[PDB]
């Protein structure tokens, strides 16, 4: 009931997600430095693609007051009545004095402290519950310190409205432990299979108009980049996903679209100037009924080069999957696609023809 | 007393079976003529309060017991200030006096954390007596007094260092680890200085503590907040508060 | 122990670059590169006799000797005008006096202090040449011995440059009452 | 008579004076702990008389002091609203307030060489070689050293601690002898602490005060091992002649 | 009578159980820092998996009501109406001796099946197992029960090489943008660490089987325990750093005198730039060799490995796979 997916994807000279200073995030694995792409970045690209197709718009935000006030201003309320209204919707859900807010910067609606995660129709329905008590909200704004007037039961039931991205990735909300939904997809960080050092690019944005005597660049600096063959892995706990979604057809569509977005997507970190878009050179989906398994230990001993790394990474993943398969025997399903026809990878299952075919036949078998 | 307990006797007479614990007085009353046993410290606005207990000080045995040395800057019970010194009329029992401390740290409302006793080490008396040399009998006790005073001095200086470091980093949780590891680590240095053995930072021979546990405070502070001072924000604030441990710091 | 060799090199190279161009040109072409790169096969003539007896120590000597020969003529004309500081102190003296960008130098200092033995040699040369572009008085012997001790733990040479930099910044600001 | 236990391993924590969440340990072993270990190696359930373990002597030579670490330890968290650790009245707490958080300290990376001297020492040794319960060091989760009993039979084992026992590597000056190592014997005593065990029963734990005196002794520098892999080797060859 | 189990398992870049401030728990062994996973963690993670199967092997397979065969059937109490309780023993999971009470104090009374409330006598399932109470100490939601312990000594898992924490700068991005973009949700820093952990645990069937009885039930409990010890992995931040793995080396040994750990083998930390699994395997072998030739004993040793390069002599006879090793060792245990 665990859909595991492995994929070898070689990214060229780029910088997917920089650190707090520009450099790419690096692990110290098997003793050697290894550039890596954080899990949250890929998870974000995945969700934006899945929800892209399934136009659910699982908006994660802080300015819920600003948008609720916008919805109330669209529906006839005055600017101040809308602002106070939204503040009533948010202030009527915590224990007392509502959820915690932050210092209001402008006269603009303040931003809550926690990050909400709701779909757009959920916000719309919240504006509806706020509209059902026009007079009450206006009456509360007349005071100096208003309180909650909304029926916390139904608004609390509206915050619990799930979504495909909410179902897969999960939600957290400390002030409302009743709305916390647990994620069903274990997403792992992507580290290189060979020690890679960072390399500095020296760039000088030059100004186009000349100066009277001398001519120098407008600005000179240096950004850190790195290339390499990343290994990526993810698990999909079907059981818990069908539990969150409830139905099995919606669940099946969510996992199929998840896998397709997992292979297809690539982050948007400094891509406008690097064009690092690519596809995984190897895709291995396995359906296991006992526990999920990652192939990270196979890539502990870093790989020395001067040769290619795709073939070595492919055949080494094969080797580790074969011996690992004969050491932890289990009746599981295995399938794989490959963008290189030189070697024949036996231990990875039955070689399907293409990525979407592989995903279709594997999600079907689950 | 603020409480009122009772014991329900058993027919045997040597066992308690039930008890009663409840309020005995409901109207507040502060006791005049403050307690001579405790140590009191003044805060702002004029209120005087007892210095609370700290399990972090009991990480090493008998730490407060040594208050007989010093003394110490406002940190001294009045009972001692009227029975331990020479302005009283004891003659030879004073030359064998030892301090003891019963501490039970707790929150002021209803939550308890730990208890501990602290009896001063008679060995610190042994060292002063065993040599039978007046100048050395005075140099030894001078070394214990010095090492103790400076030890706690850097202890509290480190506390404010961590309190300002964490309270300013976010714009705390570091005090517990910093202090615990600081005393735990800094007491073997104390016993290292009392036996004039080669200690970290400074070698035997010199006059006093030789400014060594100060380096121990740099160690504890530098490691408790080390993994968190990576980005320049935390780095510059942590450093700005880290440039205090360097004082007193009397050179060679 | 190494600092003494460091002062030897800095001595004869500090007079060498100003007193004859052949070595200055054979060393200039070795900035920020490996000691075995063919382009630097002409620098051994001058630097090889001073290394003592790990590769971090030789990397330090060759790299900083090249840095000393690749500085602009302004920085050498001021370098030849006639306890002690690291280069961190030099960065603070550069921002506080010559008007550099504080928020930038701080992130470039933590950017370089946060890297591995090879990142300090690739990021270092332009940083030090920028500092000599602003003619700040940088000490070379300490810089090399520092790079020499940069190879056993990436904590004992970084932390002291960062803390020394901030320390001297707030002392230069507190001293400006 | 007597034998030499080798108190070592990843972690050790001999607790004392802590009857609440916060647990602490001593910078050296306490006889209550290791007498609890012998008692666990001989099969005496809690509540049984421990008089047999009286008349024993424990001088302990500290090889390295080891550094103190605090172990954070939450118990009962994440569990659903109907499974935690009950209350005395039986009414559980709210799940947001259900788990209890204890921060138990422990001593890490230290090695002690105790010298047991008693009348029952031979049966105690033969009990440690095959116990009726997993013997631990301080607390159950801490696993002891394989060489828990360094030397099984030695007359005057104290003299063995003063000479001819391997020590871990430390800074030793050139051609220097007389390296100090502290050992505790039990006037000129350092402290008094509740160590003597009177009863282990969970219903009424009962202990008493016991004197302790730490004497810094001098040992010849011929015992300090090399930098790495040398110490364990030398102690293996040291335990090799035990048969002889 | 002591089943010792050792296992080398390499966990990738993750954070299994964090400290009081976010960092992963670390010990400083042999002078060097070493991230560690607390014993409780790898306990609640094994247990929470054991019951999930043992306590489910199975209400649809072996069943508890499927009794009578020795107190309600071959006893006379309505050999046909046997469902007498059965259905009356419902309104965790026990072994067999404590089940004698299950079919015992389940008879007499009247009964009232003619159309069933005395449970203060059967409820004592845990008071006398509940095998999940003899394997591991008491439950976590029931008052003590004469047997607070124990048996399954569990050791903390520390790395075999010095590993320093590494700061993962992360940030939250709000999806509703104002006219001043890049105002991300909340900047922050989360510490992670990777490495190859060493793990160890003991099972004292000697003083175990007693508390229970049917050596077959005990055999099932220890076998599923070992499988859960290798199988399980904690549940800390796995949904954000999938670190599910299997031990790269598994060594079960059955000792008849005393349990022994191989932790000191990893005292001198291992320097790297290469892999650590092979070096750790051959070094554990070496330590097992010198320790075996210094403390000679007639014990049983077996091990499985996911690398056919080296040959581990001191570890016994190299079985082919984890479940085969576990089966042959539990069998060899008696």
TrEMBL record, chain A:
UniProt cross-references to CDD domains, sorted A to Z: Cas7_I-E (cd09646)
Alphabetized InterPro entries for the sequence: CRISPR-assoc_prot_CT1975 (IPR010148)
Superkingdom of source: Bacteria
Pfam family, one: Cas_CT1975
Name recorded for this polypeptide: CRISPR-associated protein, Cse4 family
Protein source organism: Thermobifida fusca (strain YX)
Lineage, opening ranks: Bacteria, Bacillati, Actinomycetota, Actinomycetes, Streptosporangiales
Automatic annotation (TrEMBL), chain B:
Leader peptide range in chain numbering: none
Domain of life per record: Bacteria
Name listed for the protein in its UniProt record: CRISPR-associated protein, Cse1 family
Species in which this protein is naturally found: Thermobifida fusca (strain YX)
Full-sequence range covered: 276 to 543 of 549
UniProtKB/TrEMBL annotation, chain D:
UniProt xrefs under NCBIfam families: casD_Cas5e, CRISPR_cas5
Keyword DNA repair: no
Classification via InterPro entries: CRISPR-assoc_prot_Cas5 (IPR021124), CRISPR-assoc_prot_Cas5_N (IPR013422), CRISPR-assoc_prot_CasD (IPR010147)
Top-level taxon: Bacteria
Protein name per the record: CRISPR-associated protein, Cas5e family
Alphabetical UniProt keywords: Antiviral defense
Gene Ontology molecular-function annotations: RNA binding
GO BP terms: defense response to virus; maintenance of CRISPR repeat elements
From TrEMBL, chain E:
InterPro entries per record: CRISPR-assoc_prot_CT1975
CDD domains, per the entry: Cas7_I-E
Name recorded for this polypeptide: CRISPR-associated protein, Cse4 family
Organism, as annotated: Thermobifida fusca (strain YX)
Taxonomy of the source species: Bacteria, Bacillati, Actinomycetota, Actinomycetes, Streptosporangiales
